[PDB]
Amino acid sequence: AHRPVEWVQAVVSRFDEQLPIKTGTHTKVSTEHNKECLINISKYKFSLVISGLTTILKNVNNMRIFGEAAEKNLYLSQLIILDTLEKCLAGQPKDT
Amino acid sequence: LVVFGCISKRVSHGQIKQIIRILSKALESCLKGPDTYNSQVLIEATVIALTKLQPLLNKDSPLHKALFWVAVAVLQLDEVNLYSAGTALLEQNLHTLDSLRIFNDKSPEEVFMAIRNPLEWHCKQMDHFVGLNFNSNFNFALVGHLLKGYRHPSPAIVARTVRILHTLLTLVNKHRNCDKFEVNTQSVAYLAALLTVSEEVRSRCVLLDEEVLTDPKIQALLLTVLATLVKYTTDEFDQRILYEYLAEASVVFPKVFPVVHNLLDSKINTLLSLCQDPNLLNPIHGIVQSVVYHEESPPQYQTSYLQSFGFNGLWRFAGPFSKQTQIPDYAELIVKFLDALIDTYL
Numbered sequence: 425a426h427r428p429v430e431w432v433q434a435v436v437s438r439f440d441e442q443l444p445i446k447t448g449t450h451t452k453v454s455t456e457h458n459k460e461c462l463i464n465i466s467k468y469k470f471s472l473v474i475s476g477l478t479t480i481l482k483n484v485n486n487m488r489i490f491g492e493a494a495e496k497n498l499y500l501s502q503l504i505i506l507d508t509l510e511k512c513l514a515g516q517p518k519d520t
Numbered sequence: 521l522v523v524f525g526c527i528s529k530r531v532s533h534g535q536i537k538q539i540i541r542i543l544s545k546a547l548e549s550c551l552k553g554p555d556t557y558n559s560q561v562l563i564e565a566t567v568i569a570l571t572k573l574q575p576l577l578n579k580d581s582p583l584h585k586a587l588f589w590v591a592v593a594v595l596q597l598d599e600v601n602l603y604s605a606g607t608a609l610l611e612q613n614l615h616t617l618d619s620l621r622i623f624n625d626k627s628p629e630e631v632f633m634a635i636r637n638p639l640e641w642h643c644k645q646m647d648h649f650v651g652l653n654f655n656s657n658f659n660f661a662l663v664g665h666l667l668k669g670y671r672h673p674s675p676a677i678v679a680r681t682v683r684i685l686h687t688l689l690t691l692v693n694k695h696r697n698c699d700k701f702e703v704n705t706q707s708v709a710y711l712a713a714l715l716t717v718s719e720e721v722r723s724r725c726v727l728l729d730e731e732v733l734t735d736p737k738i739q740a741l742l743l744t745v746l747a748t749l750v751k752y753t754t755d756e757f758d759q760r761i762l763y764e765y766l767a768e769a770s771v772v773f774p775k776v777f778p779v780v781h782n783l784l785d786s787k788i789n790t791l792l793s794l795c796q797d798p799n800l801l802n803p804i805h806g807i808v809q810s811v812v813y814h815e816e817s818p819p820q821y822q823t824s825y826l827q828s829f830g831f832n833g834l835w836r837f838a839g840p841f842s843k844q845t846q847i848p849d850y851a852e853l854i855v856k857f858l859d860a861l862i863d864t865y866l
Contacts, residue, residue: 426815430785431808434788437793454797454798457805464809468812
């Protein structure tokens with residue numbers, strides 16, 4: 425099943441694990457390496473990385489945040505997601 | 521049998537033949553008869569008697585070399601007590617042959633594989649059934665057999681396996697008149713196996729030489745051995761060292777890394793989702809990036825490369841010890857092989 429794609433999905437699942445909105449510093453040191461993983465993958469995954477990031481961002485945007493701290497956590501989560509996406513797009517060459 | 525072996529001071533070839541025939545009959549009964557509890561103990565006793573009787577046979581006894589293959593066949597039965605007895609017999613046989621100065625002018629493959637050639641008809645069938653074709657890779661097949669020593673429950677057998685690997689590597693290096701820790705076509709397997717444990721092997725390793733390991737088959741076998749050693753392992757330092765070596769090899773040999781990934785799939789999935797070691801993650805991340813980089817490897821760069829090489833068992837053999845399952849499966853080949861060995865040397 426082209427297991428590189430499987431490991432890209434595994435990294436997506438790891439992004440699902442680390443969640444300022446949901447989880448609320450285990451996902452702080454490796455998370456930077458975990459997000460650098462996708463940042464580097466964007467140069468090679470391209471379409472798959474974009475699709476995964478877009479799905480994550482849409483899921484974050486399509487939320488409720490009824491509580492008080494939930495909105496504050498989602499504010500940081502969406503900012504981090506957008507920064508990662510922008511870095512991935514900047515890294516991705518125009519030849520893609 | 522054990523009492524006689526420990527007590528006796530001088531043996532005869534007829535005694536060795538009788539012991540081998542007793543072992544063959546016990547193995548044949550174990551495959552058919554359901555009373556394995558006694559047949560297994562008799563097999564272990566027969567092996568233990570030989571482990572003591574061998575150092576007493578004449579210097580011209582042709583059974584010295586056949587004892588090695590008897591030990592290999594015993595280790596192929598996949599029984600913890602039987603495996604321990606086989607490992608002890610292997611250590612004794614290697615020590616006796618070294619003291620007899622029989623490896624001075626020959627390599628381990630040169631000596632050991634020479635005596636099996638006369639009766640290679642059943643041996644080839646057994647190897648095909650197991651997936652340990654010595655004619656394809658003698659050293660790699662021996663290493664794959666000895667790999668279970670790390671998996672043995674008893675901590676004493678692990679040290680014996682390590683010592684056996686040390687002796688094999690030293691003999692192989694000295695056969696070509698080179699350095700002990702000199703990476704070569706043959707020494708690669710034992711160097712890889714001993715790297716996870718030996719401190720000195722972790723110093724002189726580079727490990728994934730490109731000028732030497734030009735053959736794709738040897739590199740693929742080394743990668744498969746490392747993957748098998750890392751899949752069932754649990755040591756943190758060993759896991760880190762193996763992951764670093766695998767990342768370095770994938771950087772150096774991206775073409776072959778595509779095949780060894782099938783076995784490492786479960787380990788990568790477990791690590792990439794749960795493991796939180798940045799040092800371990802970084803080599804794994806580089807390996808994943810290299811895998812994503814290339815998407816053109818054909819089936820010849822897949823598991824069929826080893827399967828067509830007749831070494832499909834290295835990814836399954838070294839696993840955890842079973843519970844009296846395959847003892848009767850390959851007993852017929854083992855019994856027939858033992859009968860053939862006795863016929864040609866008695």
